[PDB]
Amino acid sequence: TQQLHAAMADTFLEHMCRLDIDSPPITARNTGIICTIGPASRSVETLKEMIKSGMNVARLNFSHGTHEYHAETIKNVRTATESFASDPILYRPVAVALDTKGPEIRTGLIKGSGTAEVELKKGATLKITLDNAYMEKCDENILWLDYKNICKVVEVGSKIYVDDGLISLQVKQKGADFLVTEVENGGSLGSKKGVNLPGAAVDLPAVSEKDIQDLKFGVEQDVDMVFASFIRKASDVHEVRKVLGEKGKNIKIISKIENHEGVRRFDEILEASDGIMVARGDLGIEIPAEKVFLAQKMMIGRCNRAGKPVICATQMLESMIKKPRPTRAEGSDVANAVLDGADCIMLSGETAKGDYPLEAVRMQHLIAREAEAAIYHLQLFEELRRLAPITSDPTEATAVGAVEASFKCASGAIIVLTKSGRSAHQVARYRPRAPIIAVTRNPQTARQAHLYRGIFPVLCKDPVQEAWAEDVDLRVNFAMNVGKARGFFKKGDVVIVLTGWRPGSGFTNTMRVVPVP
Amino acid sequence: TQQLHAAMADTFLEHMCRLDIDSPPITARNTGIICTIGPASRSVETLKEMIKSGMNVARLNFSHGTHEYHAETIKNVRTATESFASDPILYRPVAVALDTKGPEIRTGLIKGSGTAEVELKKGATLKITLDNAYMEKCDENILWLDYKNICKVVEVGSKIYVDDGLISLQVKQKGADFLVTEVENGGSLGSKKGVNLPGAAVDLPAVSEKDIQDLKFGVEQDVDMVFASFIRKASDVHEVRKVLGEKGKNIKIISKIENHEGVRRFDEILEASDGIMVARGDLGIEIPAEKVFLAQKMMIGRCNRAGKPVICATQMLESMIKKPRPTRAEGSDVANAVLDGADCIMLSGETAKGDYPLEAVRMQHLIAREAEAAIYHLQLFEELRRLAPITSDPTEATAVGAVEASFKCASGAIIVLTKSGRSAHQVARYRPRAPIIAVTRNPQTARQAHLYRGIFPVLCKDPVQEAWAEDVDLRVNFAMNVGKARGFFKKGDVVIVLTGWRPGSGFTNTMRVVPVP
Amino acid sequence: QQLHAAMADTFLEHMCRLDIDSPPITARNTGIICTIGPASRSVETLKEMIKSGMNVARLNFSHGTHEYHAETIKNVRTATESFASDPILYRPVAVALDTKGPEIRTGLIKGSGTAEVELKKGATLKITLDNAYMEKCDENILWLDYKNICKVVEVGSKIYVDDGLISLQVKQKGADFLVTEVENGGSLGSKKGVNLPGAAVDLPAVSEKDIQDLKFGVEQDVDMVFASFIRKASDVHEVRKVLGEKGKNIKIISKIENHEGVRRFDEILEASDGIMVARGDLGIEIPAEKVFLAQKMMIGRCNRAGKPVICATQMLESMIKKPRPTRAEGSDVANAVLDGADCIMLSGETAKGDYPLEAVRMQHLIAREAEAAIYHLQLFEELRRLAPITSDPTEATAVGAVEASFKCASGAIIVLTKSGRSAHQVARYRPRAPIIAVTRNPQTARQAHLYRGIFPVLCKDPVQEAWAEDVDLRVNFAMNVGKARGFFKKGDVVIVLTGWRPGSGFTNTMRVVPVP
């Protein structure tokens, strides 16, 4: 079970050789799953099913849709989520996340001559305009764009990419408010398609006027986190902080790395941010596709060092938009992202618009769980302690002790009482085998807990009933019942418990090794 | 260059964190590239371009096509390959590989049409027959199959999969020579589509009468290797050995692992075989898709221990059958396969029938080269020596010494004179950074060299000098010119040279550290 | 404490980073065992020896009467309890009984016990068992304890006397005599120990005398037993039985002094509570060049098993006559600590030498330096990695604490323990920080000295009814000890191990706590 044979080896290579397909994993799955919501998944009925299939976070893409639209999506997410609230043992919190539009460039709409896509051929000419007369009249000869200053920041010989890095154009003649291009590799062109300009100093702000309105709207709507698009530098993260302000100060900022500058200035940005997203969609166009995996693994590694959450994002199961089963490359991708050490994995189109949203969620669930069993915990934990800077913070030291104690007795779980979430985050960064049941009365820290690997948030709805000693015992026992119910352990099993010496954040300092009643 | 900063770190995690997208790789690419040939790549003109793009091995799929068809494909491969033979410094050998049909189950034809198709809907009924009356009369109601004993080895409630696991059927009623099934997830059904029956003891032989004819044909046609389908056990590998016989005794057998039994009995099989293919297509249907990555990494690891070649096979760039650029998951897949430690990577539909065969080959080239730079050579080599069993074979000991010496002086290459190929294979298993230029007069060992990572085969066409001392020097200098031409090193650089004390296989025992003239 | 040295990624880089100008911490973890005799028997010097660092007092029952030893114990306890008025500064001191064992000794030379005879290379020497000569030994005739010597010794066999310094070759076997040629000679004294390597000596591991002494040890309330010449687990079991239920808490340390003992070491370690690497006899019984191998093997296996190991004999011989040790001797002590010994021992150096206090102080000083020089990351890492997964909560709590101690660089690990086991379990994982073991049981306080890094601390206060405040009282007592002995200051961070209720076996609670 869980490949305990594999994780005993003295070398990576021997660990690899000892991997076993007939060794099933544990029922707990630690890597969080972020699902983009859209047409295919917006209904309360399928949201309920998606929660059941494994969805932990719901992503709202503000590159599309109105504030009215998104408001209703949130409504439904919360309806479906709270539909399970009657049984607080089985209730899974579900976070809400706002992805910004950012400084993205998009095309206009095509004619609507018979079929509203247009074939672009290799060698053909294509004139790009900014003339608003053509913004809903695009075709094989004329194409309109969002970006006003495109002519100022693009040379002759520059490359332009129109959709998901599939269409490529070379600029032959710069104009005042137009361009003439040759189609390099073509294909069919749809409407409102994202445009990339690698190796060009685009002057669009990381936080537009629209982006501000949306962020302010996010604060209003009580979102849990923000996925900030096209973060180039720490200054950009600071703008987002300010816009959220004091009302939205507890909202986590996850900076999306989508471009070359972002990768270059990554450390700067990680420090300013609460977390990171490896946004491969734009990244794989903005830099050479072959270099993405390097950027991915670098960022995941540095995030794991820093103890901040990292998300692996785009095209993890593209195939499944149209098919009920993913490719072999796609199964590989998910598994490796978990092994790289990602806290969360994401689905966008696969769940926003595809034909098989539930299968895709379930598949991510299944692979992540397998991949987690395949992790070489001795080498990882060992390397993480060894890189952990000696400090006299008692929470920090208690966390490491617990994780260490968890391996030693092969605990069924690490139970952690936490108000702000931080006590559980601190256990998570040292990456235990066992699941971290984070008990809390704060429903926001419960939802935000999903960002960190291995935390199963658990919302105590019981009142602060008795004296703080029995209030702890109540909360511990609640977690104890959760674990028994969800199948993490049985009566008689051994379990690690983290508590404080008194109420309030910052006072966690007590580890107990306790049998399950 | 080559991420020499990354490979200096003391931990895997610090190595990861030190990965750099702005550190370009070396011009040498070590992982071999195997391309399946078909309609899109059969022409001599595109074969020439594919050789130039990076193709090292040409795969012939004997699950389709006649002996006459394949004979002509081989003809063209050899035409295109020998088209570069005029300049033996720049001539790249190109191997020919025969993939067997194996014990595969296929459907019949729909309406006498090769490509007409029928919609199968979720919930609908579908009757499966073995009655040969329907073998070219398949439709939404009746479907014919190859497999005679299907009814004997399948239960009610069993699952049946058609077309790369995309169609799924549940058996509701077993008959004598028929079955009644409910379509679980549907789609459109074409002709001669492969069928899988996971969790079923299928009794078809690993080597059919057709398979024998094809193998005998392979010997006739002078193929370099055999990819044996659906190898369940060592006994099966032995059957293939015997059929090749004494005439085909130098033909390498690569066992394809495509099923559960094959994985269970993998050690058995690796020992009997010259190499292994991780055939994910059938494997990912025959076992749960989530478990493939485990099977992949296990097999690659054990192959690297044993020093035998391993190939990562199917759907590595599926997207690129229809698109000029791959998904993010697909770039990830290739890179990780190289990092896992695969000797070769493969393309199937991507080059046999897709719209972008050349782009796909080039992409594999590019990623493999990047991934190779990202390898943590100190930990890998260190783990491989440490696992290398003390033995008094001088070739073995000389190989390790050379690799070790290569790292120590950061050699531009390891030059190896080899007749059978084995001396170069022995250097390859210890995985040097530097490329292995294998000089040989035997054009078969030159072609077969592509199976092992980091070997650049080089065919000496010059005649044998009588003074075996100058015959060595001639051959060494030839390699020296190759390396200078292909940009592996310059005059003044340092280089490792492996020679024997006399002519014949088995006498390599001499390592020299030599400056490039 | 060489925190620079213990950060390196290789042993070799760790070595290269060693620094003589980096001073150690005031805590010294390796226990010090001192043999008592003429030079150290007085209450006045015992007090000074306690102050110099003595943790255990060894009583050698190969010499002296029960009356003699009874008085030694009396004095040890007098001197020890002389500091009892201040329980913060009171250091427990254990009493240990080393058995005579199956040892062979010569007789006396003339009507004067302490006269000597020159034995010369090449000369003949007749060995008798005839009791007529037992006080009439000389250069021509020599008497022995061992009755069956003639039955278990060949012609050409080698016989050794006086710590292997005299060697004899047997030329002619007799019925109750032997004729030998002196190989390398020297002067021969009285009642000198004899060794017969490569000979199946049939003396029992537990003689009639040994039984009387063990029973006497139980009577006198000794803390541990150093059992001589243990050849096998069966021998350890005999000693267990003789101690019986009255002496069941007395720890048995098996002394490995011979070839069979090393051969059957695992067997013996399992049966025993601890081990002594008794190099004196061992280095004669096996080739002297192989001792270091036996030493390091045994220390390693003991550290794996989590049982105490003692490095014993001739660690500072030089200092019997001189105020300063040799360079080889300083090296020996340091390496024994680095090998991983829980305790180091002095026999002659303190039993009869001219400089007992200097010798104790020197062992103190070197041990402390050597402890600072330990590569804790590699050691702890290797010990966890070899620690067998188990659902015992004490075990898991111990490892967690040690791990937590490194993480916050704690000033100490405080452990409340009744039987001692909770503290022993922290010790086996070898923290940098000192383990302050609080206990009301004065025997477990004394026996705590066997394990490295445990500073035993005897709570004399009575039991509070509210077990919660009784814990807090005991924790605060340790807190004051540490402040007094200079292990930490107010504001420092400290690990605390407690139970959920009274009794042995219920330790399961680790708290990271600031010093008040």
Ligand SMILES: O=P(O)(O)OC[C@H]1O[C@](O)(COP(=O)(O)O)[C@@H](O)[C@@H]1O
């Ligand atoms: O170390 P030991 O002998 O197993 O005893 C540990 C015991 O000490 C305590 O922490 C304190 O209680 P006591 O006063 O009974 O020693 C217990 O809770 C625990 O069971």
Ligand SMILES: [K+]
């Ligand atoms: K967006």
Ligand SMILES: [K+]
């Ligand atoms: K085939």
Ligand SMILES: [K+]
């Ligand atoms: K003795």
Ligand SMILES: [Mg+2]
């Ligand atoms: Mg984007």
Ligand SMILES: [Mg+2]
């Ligand atoms: Mg197949």
Ligand SMILES: [Mg+2]
């Ligand atoms: Mg002795």
